């Protein structure tokens, strides 16, 4: 129903959203922070800097 709502005035988007099944779209979440460090050579860090 949200994808029916959120794309109102675009008819190609309307047909694209109404095309697929309900269970053909998913929403991935991603953690804002890193799961690690920026492990990098200090030479390469200096060159990118």
């Amino acid at each position: 129903e949200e994808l029916s709502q959120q794309f109102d005035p675009y008819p190609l988007a309307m047909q694209f959203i109404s095309q697929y099944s309900p269970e053909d779209i998913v929403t991935a979440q991603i953690e804002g922070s890193s799961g690690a460090l920026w492990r990098i050579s200090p030479p390469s860090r200096a060159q990118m800097k």
Binding site: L3, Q6, F7, Y10, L12, A13, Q15, F16, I17, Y20, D24, I25, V26, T27, A28, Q29, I30, E31, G32, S33, S34, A36, L37, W38, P42, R45, A46, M48, K49
Partner: protein, 88 residues
């Protein structure tokens, strides 16, 4: 990025709308962003921003140990949990 790469935990970044939000993952070998719900091909795709955080443990830049935190160009709640939407 220069203020980020200076080694200071204050600054941020601006992204001119690189990150899309609705991506068609096909039944083929190449996923593509939707061109219908996002019709603008450079601007419908939203904006990102990054934060570089250094935690003190370049010599000082080696004693500091750093990583990155992602968010939107104008974050509402995706500074905790960024979203992305795909259709297959």
């Amino acid at each position: 990025l220069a203020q980020l790469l200076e080694g200071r935990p204050d600054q941020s970044v601006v992204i001119p709308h690189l990150f899309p939000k609705y991506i068609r993952a096909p039944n083929g070998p190449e996923a593509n962003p939707v061109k219908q719900l996002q019709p603008d091909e450079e601007e419908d795709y939203l904006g990102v921003r990054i934060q570089l955080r250094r935690e003190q443990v370049g010599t000082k830049a080696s004693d500091f140990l750093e990583w990155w935190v992602i968010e939107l160009q104008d974050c509402k709640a995706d500074c905790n949990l960024l979203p992305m939407v795909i259709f297959s």
